[PDB]
Amino acid sequence: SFSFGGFTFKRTSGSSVKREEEVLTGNLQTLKIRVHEGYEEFTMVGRRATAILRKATRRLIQLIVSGRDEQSIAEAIIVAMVFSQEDCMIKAVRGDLNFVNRANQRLNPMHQLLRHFQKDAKVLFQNWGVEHIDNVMGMIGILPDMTPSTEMSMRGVRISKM
Numbered sequence: 001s002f003s004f005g006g007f008t009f010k011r012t013s014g015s016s017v018k019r020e021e022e023v024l025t026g027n028l029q030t031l032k033i034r035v036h037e038g039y040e041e042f043t044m045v046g047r048r049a050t051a052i053l054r055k056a057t058r059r060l061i062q063l064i065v066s067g068r069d070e071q072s073i074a075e076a077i078i079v080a081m082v083f084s085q086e087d088c089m090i091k092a093v094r095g096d097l098n099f100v101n102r103a104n105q106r107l108n109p110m111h112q113l114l115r116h117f118q119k120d121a122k123v124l125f126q127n128w129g130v131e132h133i134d135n136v137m138g139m140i141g142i143l144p145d146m147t148p149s150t151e152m153s154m155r156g157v158r159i160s161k162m
């Protein structure tokens with residue numbers, strides 16, 4: 001297990017090979033990220049939300065989240081989207097990233113991204129994408145403005161009523 005974004009991640013299936021990649025944000029800032037290539041499934045546990053995530057190579061496949069309120073659910077979605085390393089997330093960055101930790105040391109690139117989207121996830125959610133969903137009992141969709149929907153949801157994302 002490891003911790004990211006206030007969530008305890010535990011991998012429950014799959015594996016990944018690693019490779020270094022440089023990505024370029026819209027503000028023309030180069031970020032050096034470590035990509036984990038391959039299908040993996042994780043449970044995420046937070047203070048007020050939990051999630052199950054399936055990802056592949058820079059690609060969120062499926063995310064289910066449960067939480068007490070809109071805020072904590074949003075927090076889990078943000079962490080999963082950043083963790084996915086999806087291009088649309090990199091492209092959602094606005095301005096330069098220069099965040100530091102509690103010892104004023106520069107955060108590594110995944111935490112630069114996390115901090116950025118913890119401040120504002122509007123562009124992230126807006127650029128992520130939406131899809132039609134099926135009616136499945138116990139599950140509901142969520143739109144980029146956090147409105148629930150029985151018909152549509154952000155791509156790959158479902159909210160559990162349980």
Ligand SMILES: CN1CN([C@@H]2O[C@H](COP(=O)(O)OP(=O)(O)OP(=O)(O)O)[C@@H](O)[C@H]2O)c2nc(N)[nH]c(=O)c21
Binds near residue numbers: 083084085
């Ligand atoms: C995006 N990220 C970041 N990340 C981090 O990289 C750590 C795992 O690195 P690792 O131990 O070198 O790879 P691992 O798959 O565990 O190797 P192995 O299973 O052979 O022991 C995780 O604890 C986590 O902090 C990731 N780890 C996994 N498994 N998948 C991922 O997508 C990611």
